[PDB]
Design a protein around this ligand. Structure first.
Ligand SMILES: CCCCCCCCCCCCCCCCCC(=O)OC[C@H](COP(=O)([O-])OCC(O)COP(=O)([O-])OC[C@@H](COC(=O)CCCCCCCCCCCCCCCCC)OC(=O)CCCCCCCCCCCCCCCCC)OC(=O)CCCCCCCCCCCCCCCCC
Ligand SMILES: CCCCCCCCCCCCCCCCCC(=O)OC[C@H](COP(=O)([O-])OCC(O)COP(=O)([O-])OC[C@@H](COC(=O)CCCCCCCCCCCCCCCCC)OC(=O)CCCCCCCCCCCCCCCCC)OC(=O)CCCCCCCCCCCCCCCCC
Ligand SMILES: CCCCCCCCCCCCCCCCCC(=O)OC[C@H](COP(=O)([O-])OCC(O)COP(=O)([O-])OC[C@@H](COC(=O)CCCCCCCCCCCCCCCCC)OC(=O)CCCCCCCCCCCCCCCCC)OC(=O)CCCCCCCCCCCCCCCCC
Ligand SMILES: CCCCC/C=C/C/C=C/C/C=C\C/C=C\CCCC(=O)O[C@H](COC(=O)CCCCCCCCCCCCCCCCC)COP(=O)(O)O[C@@H]1[C@H](O)[C@H](O)[C@@H](O)[C@H](O)[C@H]1O
Ligand SMILES: COC1=C(OC)C(=O)C(C/C=C(\C)CC/C=C(\C)CC/C=C(\C)CC/C=C(/C)CC/C=C(\C)CC/C=C(\C)CC/C=C(\C)CC/C=C(/C)CCC=C(C)C)=C(C)C1=O
Ligand SMILES: CCCCCCCCCCCCCCCCCC(=O)OC[C@H](COP(=O)(O)OCCN)OC(=O)CCCCCCCCCCCCCCCCC
Ligand SMILES: CCCCCCCCCCCCCCCCCC(=O)OC[C@H](COP(=O)(O)OCCN)OC(=O)CCCCCCCCCCCCCCCCC
Ligand SMILES: CCCCCCCCCCCC(=O)OC[C@H](COP(=O)(O)OCC[N+](C)(C)C)OC(=O)CCCCCCCCCCC
Lengths: 86, 116, 89, 180, 76, 171, 167, 329, 57
């Protein structure tokens, strides 16, 4: 009936794309530090991510929950100086 | 430094490598026997690609609307309706005129057999 | 403003001193429109507004329609003369 | 990675010179497609990532395709850049290059003074300070606002533009049909 | 061979002719005019019977129109 | 208002507030705790926030310096709400925003933890989560049963705590 | 909420001798308030286009000797005649709202109608399915669009709150 | 920086293996549809035959004719190879798993698909013969004529999402797929996808050696799987199979790397099974049908499909209007 | 005489559903789909020879 030989190269196509997606998801989670990626980032959420990198201390999305902010937090604030745009 | 640009630069590296492998690897050995005005064309050939472009410019004119579809609700909807219908009228011009046909020049010669 | 100004100026002078064929004139026209686009979109970014972006998205469409119109004009130029001269029309 | 804009400016110059001096008419047209790509590079570079893909879609994918499609099945004679032909042009090319270049640089300035008008075009050196303000709550990007103002404030421009697209349909048909 | 009667000699006969013999144009125009006609004639029925319209989303910070009346809280 | 492109380089400033303006202590919550307690910050600090933005509207263009005294009080009242919610509802506030740091900070995917958090905060901190501008004959979204938009995977700690709150009769 | 105009606007700024009714009337009000002379103008234009084509054929025939024009031309003539007559009647009736022609017949109807809408307990110009920003932009588009009837037809279908009136 | 280059060579090894095995798969199922065996001569069950063919064709004599631009003729293979492969960034194998997460992903996927016309048309100017030109003319005319309705179907689908991000569309499709309401659009998009590669249902112009052949060969099947990827994300569910929340609350207890591994396996298994059924349907429609005259093809696109598409342009925003259902950003 | 469009037993809706939903195309598709699931004919030549009659030359 069903030829196994005809569907084996489909089987390897299926397995290669499956293993690629799984390995890539674990690579993304290892990059984030144990959580999922953010798949659609606003200008607001871009500004919110840079604010939380400023607040947590170095780490990407450690996500501190503290009462009142630290001492170096009032002084590590950033402006961006962009070039002449010639 | 994202994983987006290594792709952009790495796909050529793939190609440059493979056509190197063949040019570096295979026989050239050619000769004369191995090696080796203008024609006229129908109007629909040039017509399909000339009239292609005003429909393509409409399709990318819908592209600002379908991103703004919530903000202009009930009003930009009707403006887009009028826009689409104005261009549908030029399209019904085009298919009423039978523009994009290449039509065959020889018939069965329908004209009847009369005598004397 | 520099890139749009120089593509417009070099595009203009390549149009003007074209003596070799006709399609160099078409593509120099289109690159002139590109330079106008560059200058305007830079001004829209610097002024923080969309209105230069509005005129730029409208002139994209007008450049496309002029290319379609004018290339059909060249085809009708070519209908009766099965050659296009090097020196020009 | 500071001098990126300067690099695109220089490469655009070089690409136009390769446009206007080319063996074969379609070698010249491929240099124009390359100039479109340099343009889209500059547009992503300045901050307009939307427009660069609009340029690649509309200018490269429709206008250049129509242009190459024309060069294929039509006959076009071409002389190449002889030096006998075109150094009779060069003194006015040089005068008009310097004059048109300075004159295009002139009108960004407000002085009574001629060369204070000129050298304020080069007073570029100061680095703009970008501040964050938290006043915007949603993902209105640039294509959204183009779709708001083409459709509410400039709806009439969009409908007259529909008449222009209609004309771009009717005209090429009306020329090239030979009705019966 | 099937000839064109024209829309004017008999309307409904021409509609039947176009539905039988030019089905792509007939059903393209059918789907096309089903849109705005139902957009005209069905949405007051929906606003009357099915559900009324949603309230608008805010777009900015909502400023009210007052004059900063004094509040005794967090005086420190 | 526009974002920096084309080789922006960041820079910071070794300085201090002048003596004229008093000290104000800052908000140290990040986006998932800020988004978690956003409605309770808005419920307690509505007249303070609105007086601050009404200040900013009233004296146009001066802006920053003439509205500092109420920008003080909005920050202090939000800090009051956040330590209030820490010391009463630390474990389920933490349950909520630990749900929220997965799922793209979507409030759509953390319903079973936010039911627990809303019940705690409403009985102990006596603040209610409400969506304004919503006329009656319209159900609020975080109250509805069987929504169309369910998340991909419900978090395990919050479904375990939700079931245990069912069997305790908490909720 | 959804009827504060939030702009500054002409108040009773009449465009002629006679007082204004609306600064742009809604389409329903223009069709409701038009006179029997306006319907006579529509009938005049519907009759004048096919009779005009028959006339201009009788003056100079196309192929040398006179025939009647085809019915395919007469029906398009009658359709375009209704288009001209409706444009003429809409412009005529809008002139009475602006107060550039005599409108004492319609001024009584409007004070009766706005008294009725005060008595019915609803808004004076209609609930619209638009945000007030979109109502404002939509009425900036259709304000005084009866000028330029020669180029394009454009009408008012938005129930926006301001019409150049007070209270 | 170790992380992203290991990720990108993992993605490259997966997709450039899977375009090679698609060739072995088409020969075998074309054979079994025709009641014969496929290749079993070169692997244990016929596999690495695409490897055998590539090994031999990288040993093959390259002929640059009297007629030809040599430079144009060998970098038209590369510009079609590179833009047939560049569009592989933006496809997600899971939520936010792409090689570049940009918020305008359909605009990119739509701009790269318009760059693929040149290596037909341009390579007609290679070996300038009067019949080597107007065949390329018919090729590029069909190519542009069907990427019109391709772009149209894209913009019809974005009327439901109002976002040019791609994983936003797939997360939007969790409530229902887009083929289930718009099933005529699945039929129209399938046949436009078959035309856009110039598959041998919709082939006319078929009816070099070595590197310019294997680059065109790889570009053909990369275009196959790329337009299949486009169909998989905007019309079928992208990586979506079912809910799988209850199964996880049975199995797991907290987030671990094995749980993210399992979730990525499920998501890209759903995406790959859509894509594999789609490539099977490409080969299955290749097996059963004769080809087209150019006039049947142009009549088909401009006179039949496009007016129906105008009707769809009118009908779908109108039903999004009748029920007050406009998608928000 | 060949029948006109009006003297036909099929409705326009019935006739054009077969038009836009590709009915007999799908029928001929399903034929070769049936043939995917059956036994091929191929013999393996140096391992298995085909027919012989003694008359063969
Ligand atoms: C798909 C299902 C369609 C098959 C129809 C029924 C099977 C059959 O016998 O067909 C011939 C049947 C008569 O067959 P027969 O030769 O007389 O008797 C055969 C014996 O029974 C011998 O029959 P059989 O042993 O071949 O089938 C037994 C069946 C039932 O056996 C069982 O009871 C165990 C079931 C366990 C699950 C099997 C999973 C099979 C997965 C298949 C993959 C998708 C295909 O399942 C199997 O065991 C098949 C094994 C397949 C192994 C394939 C190897 C690929 C691996 C790739 C790896 C990928 C990662 C995963 O006639 C018809 O069905 C006529 C209809 C033909 C058209 C139907 C088309 C519908 C499907 C379209 C699919 C589009 C793609
Ligand atoms: C509003 C603006 C209107 C814009 C124009 C839209 C026109 C319709 C587009 C049709 C596209 C497809 C098409 O042509 O199909 C033709 C097709 C029949 O064509 P055929 O006979 O096969 O073609 C070969 C023949 O040689 C063809 O035989 P033929 O020589 O008789 O021509 C065939 C015919 C085929 O097309 C038609 O016959 C369709 C006509 C549709 C428009 C109907 C307008 C009705 C106006 C109101 C009432 C007017 C009369 C009132 C008189 C008494 C009043 C007291 O086309 C024409 O005759 C050209 C008509 C040109 C437009 C006429 C002017 C309309 C103005 C409306 C005035 C509105 C007033 C307010 C606005 C004022 C603004 C300030 O029939 C239809 O599509 C009928 C529509 C089906 C509906 C269901
Ligand atoms: C005279 C001709 C038209 C008369 C048709 C009868 C309409 C009627 O009496 O219904 C009233 C009806 C009144 O409703 P109601 O419940 O009695 O009163 C309460 C308010 O409506 C409620 O107000 P609201 O604020 O609550 O409403 C918000 C408002 C916000 O949206 C709007 O109202 C739209 C604003 C846009 C104004 C554009 C003005 C018209 C421009 C014509 C072309 C200009 C070309 C310029 C180019 C340069 O409207 C809506 O939300 C309704 C959306 C309607 C969707 C359906 C549209 C179907 C279009 C089909 C027309 C086919 C024409 C083919 C011609 C060939 O309102 C509408 O149906 C609105 C229709 C919008 C215009 C549609 C047709 C415009 C005319 C097109 C051709 C014009 C003549 C030909 C010139 C040459 C180029 C085409
Ligand atoms: C990436 C790699 C992965 C690929 C795997 C696929 C493996 C495929 C197996 C490949 C086997 C190699 C067989 C290739 C082969 O015909 O070369 C024979 C030589 O005689 C050997 O046999 C010489 C054999 C050379 C074998 C390699 C030597 C080490 C590499 C040197 C670089 C070809 O003589 P030839 O004079 O015409 O070759 C040259 C040369 O190919 C061109 O570059 C010149 O332009 C041309 O004029 C011509 O003269
Ligand atoms: C006889 O009728 C016909 C067939 O049989 C039905 C065909 O299959 C086909 C299709 C022909 C083929 C598939 C032969 C394909 C030709 C080849 C040279 C296969 C080459 C394989 C590759 C290029 C794989 C390359 C992969 C890599 C380099 C890996 C990178 C990491 C045609 C045209 C045909 O006419
Ligand atoms: C609108 C947008 C969508 C469609 C866009 C494209 C429309 C194209 C129309 C067109 O040009 O059709 C011309 C064609 C003429 O056919 P023929 O005379 O045979 O000549 C063929 C060679 N030129 O025309 C025809 O043969 C067919 C013409 C059919 C016109 C009438 C269709 C009526 C459909 C009704 C559907 C149901 C509506 C229900 C409404 C209820 C409420 C009122
Ligand atoms: C009443 C119904 C609903 C009403 C609403 C209106 C339409 C909504 C439905 C829209 C869906 C449309 C699908 C495509 C329409 C195709 C219409 C068609 O048949 O084209 C006809 C065309 C020539 O037209 P003509 O000269 O008149 O001759 C026709 C013979 N009667 O013929 C041609 O030019 C060639 C025909 C090509 C057909 C495609 C061939 C290859 C593709 C096969 C795809 C099969 C997909 C199966 C995949 C299975 C996957 C599991
Ligand atoms: C991904 C999974 C793909 C699996 C491919 C297995 C094919 C195979 O194993 O092929 C085995 C090969 C070829 O052997 P053969 O003698 O030509 O086969 C004749 C069979 N007959 C008798 C039926 C005709 O042998 C080798 O040493 C090749 C070693 C390199 C393997 C590289 C694998 C790359 C993937």
């Amino acid at each position: 009936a069903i030829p196994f030989e005809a569907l084996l190269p489909y089987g390897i196509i299926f397995g290669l794309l499956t293993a690629g997606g799984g390995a890539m998801q674990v690579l993304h989670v290892y990059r984030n530090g144990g959580v999922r990626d953010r798949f659609a980032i606003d200008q607001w959420d871009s500004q919110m991510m840079e604010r939380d990198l400023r607040l947590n201390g170095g780490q990407g999305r450690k996500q501190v929950d503290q009462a009142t902010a630290p001492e170096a937090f009032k002084h590590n604030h950033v402006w961006k100086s962009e070039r002449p745009l010639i | 430094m994202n994983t987006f640009i290594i792709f952009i630069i790495l796909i050529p590296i793939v190609g440059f490598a493979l056509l190197a492998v063949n040019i570096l690897l295979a026989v050239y050995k050619p000769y004369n026997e191995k090696l080796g005005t203008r024609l006229a064309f129908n109007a629909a050939f040039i017509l399909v690609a000339i009239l292609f472009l005003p429909f393509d410019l409409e399709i990318s004119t819908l592209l600002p609307y379908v991103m703004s579809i919530y903000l202009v609700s009930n009003y930009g909807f009707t403006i887009v309706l009028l826009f689409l219908l104005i261009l549908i009228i030029g399209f019904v011009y085009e298919i009423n005129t039978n523009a994009l046909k290449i039509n065959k020049h020889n018939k069965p010669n329908t004209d009847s057999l009369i005598y004397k | 403003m520099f890139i749009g100004t120089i593509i417009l100026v070099l595009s203009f002078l390549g149009f003007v001193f074209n003596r070799r064929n006709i399609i160099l004139a078409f593509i120099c026209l289109e690159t002139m429109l590109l330079g106008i686009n560059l200058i305007l979109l830079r001004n829209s970014v610097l002024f923080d507004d969309i209105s230069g972006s509005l005129f730029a998205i409208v002139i994209i469409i007008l450049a496309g329609v002029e290319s379609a119109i004018g290339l059909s004009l060249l085809v009708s130029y070519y209908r009766l003369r099965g050659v296009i001269n090097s020196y020009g029309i | 990675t500071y001098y990126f804009i300067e690099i695109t400016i220089f490469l655009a110059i070089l690409c136009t010179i390769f446009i206007i001096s080319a063996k074969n008419p379609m070698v010249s047209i491929l240099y124009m497609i390359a100039l479109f790509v340099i343009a889209a590079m500059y547009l992503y570079l300045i901050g307009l990532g939307i427009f660069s893909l609009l340029y690649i879609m509309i200018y490269i994918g429709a206008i250049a395709v129509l242009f190459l499609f024309i060069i294929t099945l039509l006959d076009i004679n071409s002389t190449e850049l002889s030096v006998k032909s075109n150094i009779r042009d060069l003194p006015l090319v040089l005068i008009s290059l310097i004059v048109l270049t300075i004159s295009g640089l002139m009108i960004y300035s407000n002085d009574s003074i001629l060369i204070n008008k000129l050298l304020e075009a080069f007073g570029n050196d100061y680095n703009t300070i970008i501040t964050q303000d938290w006043f915007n709550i949603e993902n209105t990007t640039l294509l959204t606002t183009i779709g708001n103002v083409l459709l509410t404030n400039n709806a009439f421009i969009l409908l007259v533009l529909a008449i222009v697209l209609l004309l771009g349909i009717i005209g090429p048909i009306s020329i090239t049909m030979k009705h019966k | 061979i099937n000839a064109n009667p024209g829309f004017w000699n008999g309307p409904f006969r021409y509609l039947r002719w176009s539905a039988h013999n030019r089905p792509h144009l007939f059903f393209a125009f059918a789907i096309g005019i089903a849109g705005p006609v139902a957009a005209l004639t069905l949405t007051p029925l929906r606003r009357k019977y099915l559900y009324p319209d949603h309230s608008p989303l805010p777009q900015s910070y909502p400023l009210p129109q007052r004059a900063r009346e004094g509040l005794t809280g967090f005086d420190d | 208002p526009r974002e920096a492109a084309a080789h922006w380089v960041p820079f910071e400033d070794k300085a201090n507030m002048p003596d004229n303006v008093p000290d104000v202590v800052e908000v140290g919550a990040t986006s998932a705790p800020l988004l978690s307690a956003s409605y309770f910050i808005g419920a307690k600090c509505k007249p303070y926030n609105d007086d601050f933005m009404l200040c900013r509207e009233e004296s146009q263009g001066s802006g920053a310096i003439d509205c500092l005294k109420e920008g003080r009080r909005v920050t202090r009242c939000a800090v009051s709400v956040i330590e209030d919610i820490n010391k009463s509802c630390l474990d389920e506030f933490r349950l909520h925003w630990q749900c929220l740091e997965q799922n793209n900070h979507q409030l759509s995917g953390c319903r079973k933890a936010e039911a627990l958090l809303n019940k705690c905060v409403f009985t102990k901190l006596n603040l209610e989560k409400k969506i304004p501008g919503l006329r009656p004959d319209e159900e609020p979204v975080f109250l509805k049963k069987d929504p169309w938009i369910k998340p991909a995977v419900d978090d395990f700690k919050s479904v375990r705590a939700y079931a245990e709150a069912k069997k305790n009769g908490t909720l | 909420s959804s009827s504060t105009p939030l702009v500054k606007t002409s108040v009773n700024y009449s465009y002629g001798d006679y007082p204004l009714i609306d600064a742009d009337p809604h389409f329903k009000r223009v069709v409701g308030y038009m006179r029997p002379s306006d319907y006579g103008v529509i009938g005049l234009a519907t009759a004048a286009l096919p009779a005009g084509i028959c006339f201009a054929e009788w003056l100079d025939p196309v192929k040398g000797k006179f025939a009647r024009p085809s019915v395919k031309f007469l029906r398009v003539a009658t359709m375009l005649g209704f288009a001209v007559g409706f444009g003429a009647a809409y412009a005529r009736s809008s002139l009475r709202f602006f107060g550039v022609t005599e409108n004492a017949r319609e001024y009584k109807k409007d004070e009766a109608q706005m008294a009725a809408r005060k008595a019915a307990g609803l808004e004076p110009y209609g609930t619209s399915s638009l945000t007030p920003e979109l109502q404002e932009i939509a009425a900036k588009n259709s304000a005084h669009s009866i000028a330029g009837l020669f180029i394009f037809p454009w009408f008012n279908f938005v129930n926006h709150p301001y019409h150049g009136r007070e209270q | 920086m170790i992380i992203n280059i290991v990720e990108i060579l993992i993605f490259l090894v997966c997709v450039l293996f899977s375009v090679a095995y698609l060739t072995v798969a088409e020969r075998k199922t074309l054979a079994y549809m025709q009641r014969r065996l496929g290749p079993n001569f070169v692997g244990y069950y016929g596999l690495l035959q695409a490897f055998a063919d590539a090994v031999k064709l990288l040993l093959k004599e390259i002929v640059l004719p009297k007629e030809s631009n040599y430079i144009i003729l060998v970098i038209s293979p590369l510009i079609t190879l590179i833009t047939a492969l560049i569009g592989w960034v933006v496809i997600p194998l899971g939520p936010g798993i792409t090689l570049g997460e940009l918020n305008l992903g359909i605009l990119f996927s739509l701009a790269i698909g318009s760059l693929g016309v040149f290596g037909s048309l341009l390579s007609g100017w290679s070996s300038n013969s009067k019949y080597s030109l107007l065949g390329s003319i018919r090729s590029t005319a069909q190519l542009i004529s069907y990427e019109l309705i391709l772009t149209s179907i894209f913009i019809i689908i974005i009327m439901f999402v109002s976002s040019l991000n791609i994983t936003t569309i797939i997360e939007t499709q969790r409530v229902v797929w887009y083929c289930i309401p718009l099933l005529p659009l699945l039929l129209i998009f399938f046949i436009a996808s078959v035309a856009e590669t110039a598959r041998p249902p919709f082939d006319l112009t078929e009816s070099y050696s070595g590197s310019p052949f294997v680059f065109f060969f790889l570009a053909e099947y990369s275009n196959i799987i790329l337009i299949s990827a486009f169909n998989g994300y905007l019309l079928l569910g992208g990586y979506l199979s079912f809910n799988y929340s209850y199964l996880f609350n049975i199995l797991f207890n907290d987030y671990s790397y094995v749980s993210f591994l399992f979730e990525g396996l499920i998501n890209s298994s759903a995406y790959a099974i859509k894509l594999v059924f789609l490539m099977f349907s490409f080969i299955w429609v290749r097996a059963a049908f004769p080809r087209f005259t150019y006039d049947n093809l142009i009549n088909f696109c401009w006179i039949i499909l496009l007016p129906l598409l105008f009707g769809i342009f009118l009908i779908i925003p109108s039903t999004l209007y009748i029920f007050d259902s406009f998608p928000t950003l | 005489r060949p029948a006109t469009w009006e003297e036909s037993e099929e409705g326009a809706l019935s006739k054009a559903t077969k038009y836009f939903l590709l009915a007999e195309m799908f029928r001929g598709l399903y034929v070769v789909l049936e043939q995917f699931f059956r036994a091929p004919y191929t013999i393996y030549y140096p391992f298995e020879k085909g027919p012989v009659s003694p008359r063969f030359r």
